[PDB]
Amino acid sequence: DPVRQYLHEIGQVPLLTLEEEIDLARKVEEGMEAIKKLSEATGLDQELIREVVRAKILGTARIQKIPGLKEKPDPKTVEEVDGKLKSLPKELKRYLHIAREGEAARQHLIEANLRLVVSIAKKYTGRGLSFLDLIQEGNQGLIRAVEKFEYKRRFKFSTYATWWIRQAINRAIADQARTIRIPVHMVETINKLSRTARQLQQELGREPSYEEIAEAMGPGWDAKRVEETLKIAQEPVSLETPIGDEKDSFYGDFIPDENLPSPVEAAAQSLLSEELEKALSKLSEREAMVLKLRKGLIDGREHTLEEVGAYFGVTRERIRQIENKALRKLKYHESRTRKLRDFLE
Amino acid sequence: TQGLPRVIELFEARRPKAKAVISEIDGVVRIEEGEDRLSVFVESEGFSKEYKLPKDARLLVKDGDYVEAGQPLTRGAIDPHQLLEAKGPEAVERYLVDEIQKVYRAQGVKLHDKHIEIVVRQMLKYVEVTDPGDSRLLEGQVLEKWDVEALNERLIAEGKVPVAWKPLLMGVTKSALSTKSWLSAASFQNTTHVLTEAAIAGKKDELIGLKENVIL
Amino acid sequence: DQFRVGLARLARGVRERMVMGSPDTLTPAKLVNSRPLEAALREFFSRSQ
Amino acid sequence: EKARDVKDTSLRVPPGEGGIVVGRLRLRRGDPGVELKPGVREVVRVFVA
Amino acid sequence: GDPPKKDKALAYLFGLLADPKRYDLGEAGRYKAEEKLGVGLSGRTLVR
Amino acid sequence: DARMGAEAIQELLKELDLEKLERELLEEMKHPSRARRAKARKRLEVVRAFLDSGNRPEWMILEAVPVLPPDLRPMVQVDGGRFATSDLNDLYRRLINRNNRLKKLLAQGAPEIIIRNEKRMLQEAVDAVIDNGRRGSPVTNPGSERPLRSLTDILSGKQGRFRQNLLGK
Amino acid sequence: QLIHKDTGLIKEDEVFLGHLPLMTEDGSFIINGADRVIVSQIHRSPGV
Amino acid sequence: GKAQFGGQRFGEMEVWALEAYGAAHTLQEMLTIKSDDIEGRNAAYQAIIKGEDVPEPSVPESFRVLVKELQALALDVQTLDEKDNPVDIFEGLASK
Amino acid sequence: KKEVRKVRIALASPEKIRSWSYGEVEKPETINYRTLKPERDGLFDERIFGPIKDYECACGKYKRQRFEGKVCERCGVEVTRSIVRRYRMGHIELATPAAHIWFVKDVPSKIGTLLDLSATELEQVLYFNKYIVLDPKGAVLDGVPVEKRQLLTDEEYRELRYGKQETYP
RNA sequence: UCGA
DNA sequence: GCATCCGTGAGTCGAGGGTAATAAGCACAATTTAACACTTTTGTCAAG
DNA sequence: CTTGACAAAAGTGTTAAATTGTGCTATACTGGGAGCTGTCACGGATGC
Ligand SMILES: [Zn+2]
């Protein structure tokens, strides 16, 4: 059972005292700024030796071994760096070790206030992610708040962390939610609208008409706007939805397939094609061939008057009147024969 | 008339409800009752075994008589596998079809034994391996009757020792799942199981069966 | 019966909402919900067997 | 033939069902005492007797 | 599932019977069972 | 190296030799005890199943997950105007969510705990998009008790694509 | 009535729950404009 | 269904009975040309419309769906021929 | 062009599966809520699986059969029938390797019968709960040195890799 | 849920 | 080997039936899309 | 069939207006949560 699993996995470590908290933040920031001063040392970048710290701390080669087929070169961009600062005097080395212990501190910190995250996200169930899923995204929120927090602020880390938790959570549900992808601002305005609708549904003692709720919103909000975003609201309905009073009556197999041709349609198209194909020979040998271009027959792509004119060596005007007389000669044969009179839709 | 349940009981080779006890050889008949357990010793000239029986189920044979291989003792249905390895495949077929037709004819439905026979032969067509010998087989690795027949023949010609085997009777369900084509059993039931044991073993189908084709 | 359990869902809609907030502006006007109850009972009359 | 961007959506009647007409009721969106689906304009309902 | 505390053994178990809302037993059940066992009772719970 | 989860099982199953265990199980089968004899029978059964077929068991740990074509997992609207779709879609979706989120966590050097847990969710999610219900209560469309029908859900069963579409139609 | 535990200030408010279907004449409710009915259910009476 | 404008289904037992008669083609056409076959139904309508005789079907096309499903399960689906060789069931379709 | 008399089955390997795929499905999202066009990487993507329209590209610079199979440079959709939407698969590259619950939880349990494992054993192993022993490297356990083909737990894994401590209040 |  | 658990099944076609309702926000950068201006193509017309 | 003239259809270039994607909020919030029943038969793994 994967749920109660993490439930006992979090309580495996104590949370923290104020002391431990401040100490954690202490060695964290001192470590990171040590990485800064280290960036001034061998000329390395700010973020470079940082992730390199993860290279020799978070484990052996397992870290960058499989981050997709492309993340960042291990034997090239990492290896030499790991050996470039090994040659360096006491100062740069002490800064090194400071970096190591600092990042580790970041980790421990994260786990405690991860217990915290667990509670917070535990209150958010039913967003389309049952428990862990939700929680996990929520967790990473704290992570971003871990590096952005300062012990100097004299605030319990729980506060900052919490707000960032609700951040990660709401962004995650905004980006996942219904099966149809929806933009973040869009989701915002959605839950905004439904908020209002809820409120004045309870106040008015009844459900609001489109115009009064849309008015309750503000400027530019009308019945059509709410009706619109309401149409977008509802998600795709599952095909596996059983209908009727039985189990065996399904939904998915009740949908017609019009995206593909039908036998009647296949023979219909083949028919128009053939019947018109033989109706072709009764036209002037030149004007028929020309007519195959202007109407987009030969290669499927319609050729302009200029092109067909560039074909028979005649001006485009010629091709034009050619089309007039051709289509009308055909018109005689049609109005007479009454063979192709069908296909009138 | 136990009816359809009796039928299924025969077709699936499932353990009979009342199931009767049978002898494993031709011995001598002896009754032993110490007022506790009513047991009956069947002892050949050089052998013996007894059988634990209750005082309730009424016996068939009378004390001091002679017995036969797989001969009945208590009144009631006989376990298929029980007489299978006892009296042999012949009498297996015999009693099988005989009972099925017993119920059928009882209920007023007459049909030629042929059909039932086809099913029955399709039940016993598998055998368990004993001492693979020169063959590439493995002990207790169970396969079809036809195939092991061919195998043994070829090995006889080659001057190589054949394989011993025990006739193994199973229910029709089991036979459907053990059939050549994975497609057939896949269609039938226990899909997951079959598909697994098929795909892993990389077995190719020749579409020899009808429903093993009808899919295609 | 359905009213009992549905209104219990609404009871969740009560006990939980009344503490995120400020007891200053408070009244069942803003504390009472509809959809848990109204849709529970809406559910009994249709999708039920 | 003009290609008329407007195509026929018209509602026919199934085979085997035929006869006269009694009930004819049509309510568009916004009519008194009516609500429609989110993104529908009108609806028409006719009885066939 | 959850750590076997003391104070939580006074809670998780309480809701099972004593809670009138989680054990709610029809006025008929209380009735018939009462006159059945040859005893008497009022509350629709098991134990108060 | 204690590594836990699927990567490890990949390791061992990638390191195996069927030849050695073949001959070994052969000599282990002749054991006069019917127990060892029988376990050898079955184990060597599956062993031979991997041998003759010429198939490598490491594939069972498969990395790249085959995605079913879109038209096989249809999404289309109706007269009502709303859109519908199969369940396998949502399954696939949430799966990719977990996989990607994991990927964003791994490179940034996230704590090992969250990582491991996310890998757990990866396995459970995949396996859910296959056999759903084989482990725990199946993942369903949120709020509805209707289980999300996976591959193995359609392949087998009464109205499954077998009996419903290939043995009758 | 909403009563504060601290100030002991009773603030009474009447609210609107929603729309609950009511029974028609013959005993058949109208849901979604269609005449429907609730068929009686049966189970072993609660008790011992 | 009726108002859905659709044909009857041929049950498993129906199939079995049909086989019992030993009508091989009737069954084949049933499961292929007469039902969902890719060009089968189409070429059929073509045939009878022209008065010719309906050609022989290739893929039932419910079958092909089955195949690609199995592909989604990473079941290698190998269709051989008279002697042990890959046959392309999907014409030029996924060759990558 | 050829009679099909035979149907085989086997285990699809990761590389094979990659070859089956026309691309990786990245963004776990159906389509745009506005355009209803398959999302950039979305599961319904026409850019890899197949065109939404018959014998056409996406952006519309190739609208016709005069271009056959030629990949569009402004879109990257092979111009062909939408039929390929049913026959062309994708794949998802999973960060950490993951097994398949089929041969795991099935009655014979292939992977288990192979590695000489047990049901609930491999159950907590594979699912990222319990550790296992891969090359102990002179590792000690309670006086009996641990060897491979064995299981460990969290506490003892850290205890052996990071040492045995005691915290005194 | 109701025919057969 | 002896009791005790997860696991897999279980009748045919149909007729209909069906439709629905939870959750934070605000500034801002980054693009996308809609608007607009204007060059060119092409189809039409007057008239060789 | 042809030349010039010209209206509209169409092409292209540049912007304004919209849509959409991102980051962050500091008192303190630090181990879920929901229940459900009135089979039955057999096969296998597993705990006695
Ligand atoms: Zn294009």
Curated annotation (Swiss-Prot), chain A:
DNA-binding region listed in the record: 305-324
Region of interest (Sigma-70 factor domain-1), ranges: 1-35
Keyword Calcium: no
GO cellular component: cytoplasm
Key words, A-Z: Cytoplasm, DNA-binding, Sigma factor, Transcription, Transcription regulation
Region described as Sigma-70 factor domain-4: 279-331
Compartments where found: Cytoplasm
A GO MF label: sigma factor activity
Superkingdom, taxonomy of origin: Bacteria
Assembly description: Interacts transiently with the RNA polymerase catalytic core formed by RpoA, RpoB, RpoC and RpoZ (2 alpha, 1 beta, 1 beta' and 1 omega subunit) to form the RNA polymerase holoenzyme that can initiate transcription.
Domain notes: Contains 4 domains, connected by flexible linkers. In the active conformation, the domains are in an extended conformation, each making extensive interactions with the RNA polymerase catalytic core. In the autoinhibited state, sigma-70 factor domain-1 packs closely together with sigma-70 factor domains-2 and -4, contrary to the extended conformation that is seen when the protein is part of the RNA polymerase holoenzyme.
Protein name: RNA polymerase sigma factor SigA
The organism of origin for this protein: Thermus aquaticus
Gene: sigA
Swiss-Prot record, chain G:
Domain of life, source organism: Bacteria
Residues passing through the membrane, by range: none
Subunit structure: The RNAP catalytic core consists of 2 alpha, 1 beta, 1 beta' and 1 omega subunit. When a sigma factor is associated with the core the holoenzyme is formed, which can initiate transcription.
Purpose: DNA-dependent RNA polymerase catalyzes the transcription of DNA into RNA using the four ribonucleoside triphosphates as substrates.
Protein family membership: Belongs to the RNA polymerase beta chain family.
Name listed for the protein in its UniProt record: DNA-directed RNA polymerase subunit beta
Part of the intact protein present: 99 to 146 of 1119
From Swiss-Prot, chain H:
Quaternary structure and partners: The RNAP catalytic core consists of 2 alpha, 1 beta, 1 beta' and 1 omega subunit. When a sigma factor is associated with the core the holoenzyme is formed, which can initiate transcription.
Role of this protein: DNA-dependent RNA polymerase catalyzes the transcription of DNA into RNA using the four ribonucleoside triphosphates as substrates.
Family classification: Belongs to the RNA polymerase beta chain family.
Annotated protein name in UniProt: DNA-directed RNA polymerase subunit beta
Species assigned in the record: Thermus aquaticus
Gene behind the chain: rpoB
Swiss-Prot record, chain I:
Binding site for Zn(2+) 1: C57, C59, C72, C75
Domain of life of the native organism: Bacteria
Similarity field: Belongs to the RNA polymerase beta' chain family.
Subunit structure: The RNAP catalytic core consists of 2 alpha, 1 beta, 1 beta' and 1 omega subunit. When a sigma factor is associated with the core the holoenzyme is formed, which can initiate transcription.
Protein task: DNA-dependent RNA polymerase catalyzes the transcription of DNA into RNA using the four ribonucleoside triphosphates as substrates.
Identification of the protein by name: DNA-directed RNA polymerase subunit beta'
Organism of derivation: Thermus aquaticus
